[PDB]
Amino acid sequence: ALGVALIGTGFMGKCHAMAWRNVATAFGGLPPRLEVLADMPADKAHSLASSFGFARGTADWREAVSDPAVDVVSITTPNGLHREMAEAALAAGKHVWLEKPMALSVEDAQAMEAAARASDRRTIIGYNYTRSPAFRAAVDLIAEGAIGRPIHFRGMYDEDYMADWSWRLTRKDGGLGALGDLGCHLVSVMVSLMGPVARVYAQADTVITDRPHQGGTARVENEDQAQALIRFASGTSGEFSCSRVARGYRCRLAWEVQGTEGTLRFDQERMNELWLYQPGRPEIDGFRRILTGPAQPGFAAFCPGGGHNFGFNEQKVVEAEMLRQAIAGRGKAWPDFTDGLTIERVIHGMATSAQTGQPVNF
Template sequence: MDSVGVGLIGTGYMGKCHAIAYSAVATVFGLSTRPRLELLCDLGAEQAAAAAAAFGFARSTDDWHKLVSDPAVDVVSITTPNGLHPAMAIEAARNGKHVYCEKPLALTLEKAEAMAAAVREAGVKSLVGYNYTKNPAVSHAKRLVEQGAIGRLLHFRGCFDEDYLADPALPHSWRMQKEKAGAGALADMASHLIHMAQHLCGPIGAVMADLTTMHAERPINDGSHAATGRVENDDTVSALVRFRAGFSGSLDSSRIAWGRKSRFAWELHGSAGMIAFDQERMNELQLYQAKGPKAEQGFKTILSGPAHPPYGNFVPAPGHSLGYNDIKTVEVAHLMRGLAGEETLYPNFTDALDTERVMHAMLRSAKEGQWVSLD
């Protein structure tokens, strides 16, 4: 296999991220297996054709059923609203296509499980877009934990805050509808936080969560100043968690946090130190080690560079920094190598069920007002 035919469904923010990564990945990584941009799908034939020309795809369609059955397409990228993921992924798998899907997998755990079953039964490969764990700084943090740099893990504290819906005058959209988005801040941002926590600390065994909707109505863009739509999902999430390894953690997320642009920040507390990270400074890792003279102990800033692979594939000099789309390119490189049989894809649909189960346990906990076990 020297090339992989790519079909992309959706051309919004994440669709463009996928297209950028597919276009850059061979240049950055010198892969033996390269993506071939075959077919793009979006609503409306004219819009799809314009996006295909802009993104570098050979052809376009406004019918996703045609894309997932097209003989030139080997892998389907799904970047649509969450509620559309299951039908597209399942049909793609049944047509023998590999599936690269954005998170979360589905609106319900049952549909997420059906997606995992479909790719397993079809014998195709899958990958879910939890790209933040592909950051070289995060990979180094995981290595530090595994090497015992901060001793035994004692606590995880994390938050993911943004202000993209902080203004109550911003209009209603699909992201506020349970039928299309499912949960709100929980699905959109806290899903990444849950995945990161489990990536670094192992499985979560129990949760206690609270979800709130602070802007219950939002204006509808129909030309009327009076029309509003009900916000059906959560603006904020707060949760206590217990890891199966025997320690606790806290997870918080808000989509209405003024001033926060992408504050995906977390701390790992250990018996001999601490590691801290903030996505708004995504090329820096903070390390505290409780050793040496007390007067000289303090946090050390580790700046990403070629010593933290695959940073060096992008730039040979430390301190020049990677960006969000670079991390997506790392993810697509992993996808290409996985499809070529050179790496095991992670997280695949089955792996991602671990995050989905925690999310739905949080929804149940918030509804029932009590701890929920994942055993």
């Protein structure tokens, strides 16, 4: 049974807590033991440790990583703390489940990538949109030749949370803006579908410059939206965007792969639907709405009946299981810190391209 440390209890902290709690319920084997939860202040950590089922809560994150009963550390803190916490966890001999993006800079991710190799421990980064049954089904369909050769990718990730204060808005805590917060997710899906990125040309904007209800000066330090044209190492084209100010959208990570023999389209706001076009007889020709069910990777561990909608949080249960199987030497987790470094190079290259008005080659 894997011993678990959890650092942070917010959006992702609670998501990881629920995932670790049910990974064996869904996939079998032994239930992970919830050992230590870290958060500030201490009374909050004690409270959440009690309700989450952790053996203790502490205000000292170092206390979580150094617990001998811990085998794996979930890190769900602001981006500015990822590098320090992940390097400490790896040095401590712990496997690491790190939230995206890796850190603030390419240099940070490079140091982390080197630390991971030196430690001989497993790493996985929290790119949970790669875990839906629909997404995994799409990957397999492409590999099987269902849409022929990919000839164009178009992807977006729109939300509007910033169009209504967060550490996400600072360079010391968040790093990049929309690119770092949402863009990296789109990259994780995009490269899994299309292969590695060879070239980007990008542009960006900040639409809301100051948080109007903060009272004191509250300068937004990073971008609200960005777009890029892509060339993949295959030579194929892509379109790419992200935004945290696109009003009306809440989790609109949407993508499509146009192939020579068909098209696949997906929208995370309806994460249980995968749209597949393949040529057919004229009288019955059109896109198929594939509703998520037990034929798709991972779904049958949660439900034997199709159409009982798989949830956002259940992607994290799948993610936990992939890390669990990697730790046992039964599969390879993706992306590890090496695969993740490439993703960081992409989003940071997009940022560079937007700043300079020049294409960036990889």
